[PDB]
Amino acid sequence: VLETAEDIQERRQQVLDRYHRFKELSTLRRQKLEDSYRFQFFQRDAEELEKWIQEKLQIASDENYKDPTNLQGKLQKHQAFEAEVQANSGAIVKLDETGNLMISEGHFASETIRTRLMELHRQWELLLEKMREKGIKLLQ
Amino acid sequence: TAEDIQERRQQVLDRYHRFKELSTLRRQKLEDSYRFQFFQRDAEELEKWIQEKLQIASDENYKDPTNLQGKLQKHQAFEAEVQANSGAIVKLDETGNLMISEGHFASETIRTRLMELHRQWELLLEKMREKGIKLLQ
């Protein structure tokens, strides 16, 4: 009167095997779609970091009139600025990992990834330089 | 003014260091704050993206408009985008778990948000495989 557990599980297994067969037969299409999306996300990531770096670069030389404010207050402002920037030093590291992995996989946008990375590393190294320049040139 | 503007940069520089460890605690306090801010902004972004996905994974189920070939194409793009973004939650785990391992002040909030993120990501995957199977009927 009752159906065996084995029969019930086998019915589910057959549904899964059919589903897996269909994904396997369309592996190439699936690969290309995922590759396109991975690049889209990577570009989104690069743009987010880039927009931020430029914002902090504008600041690292802006609001610079003469500074009738306590040397102490200006000091701790720069220390706050330095803390923010240090807090975000992980962003560029993650871009590298992402971009380099696709590069190592022969992703179709390798060359665009390559130049995008050196351009962000350049803007990043710049920000760290102008941050130091501002740091010592207030003690002088 | 030459001597005046030299007393200032000497008085501050004098108090600027009285014990290095206290200075270390201070900027550690500042870094922890911004590190937390970045995590929160990233978590809400992934949270928002995941919910948009769960919703899409159920608009029209068995309708007439699109044919089987078209619906299957749309579903494969859906799975593709989701898998393409599976690194999003990995990076948050790394960032959030590092703060927890340090004794960061918002540890509880962070631990709790990571848990809920994984739960929702897991059922996005689940629902996704359900929709896929349903299309083979």
From Swiss-Prot, chain A:
<comment type="similarity">
    <text>Belongs to the spectrin family.</text>
</comment>
<comment type="function">
    <text>Fodrin, which seems to be involved in secretion, interacts with calmodulin in a calcium-dependent manner and is thus candidate for the calcium-dependent movement of the cytoskeleton at the membrane.</text>
</comment>
<feature type="repeat" description="Spectrin 1">
    <location>
        <begin position="38"/>
        <end position="139"/>
    </location>
</feature>
<comment type="subunit">
    <text>Like erythrocyte spectrin, the spectrin-like proteins are capable of forming dimers which can further associate to tetramers. Interacts (via C-terminal spectrin repeats) with TRPC4. Interacts with CALM and EMD. Interacts with isoform 1 of ACP1. Identified in a complex with ACTN4, CASK, IQGAP1, MAGI2, NPHS1 and SPTBN1. Interacts with SHANK3 (via ANK repeats). Interacts with CLN3; this interaction regulates the fodrin localization at the plasma membrane.</text>
</comment>
<protein>
    <recommendedName>
        <fullName>Spectrin alpha chain, non-erythrocytic 1</fullName>
    </recommendedName>
</protein>
From Swiss-Prot, chain B:
<protein>
    <recommendedName>
        <fullName>Spectrin alpha chain, non-erythrocytic 1</fullName>
    </recommendedName>
</protein>
<comment type="function">
    <text>Fodrin, which seems to be involved in secretion, interacts with calmodulin in a calcium-dependent manner and is thus candidate for the calcium-dependent movement of the cytoskeleton at the membrane.</text>
</comment>
<comment type="similarity">
    <text>Belongs to the spectrin family.</text>
</comment>
<comment type="subunit">
    <text>Like erythrocyte spectrin, the spectrin-like proteins are capable of forming dimers which can further associate to tetramers. Interacts (via C-terminal spectrin repeats) with TRPC4. Interacts with CALM and EMD. Interacts with isoform 1 of ACP1. Identified in a complex with ACTN4, CASK, IQGAP1, MAGI2, NPHS1 and SPTBN1. Interacts with SHANK3 (via ANK repeats). Interacts with CLN3; this interaction regulates the fodrin localization at the plasma membrane.</text>
</comment>
<feature type="repeat" description="Spectrin 1">
    <location>
        <begin position="35"/>
        <end position="136"/>
    </location>
</feature>
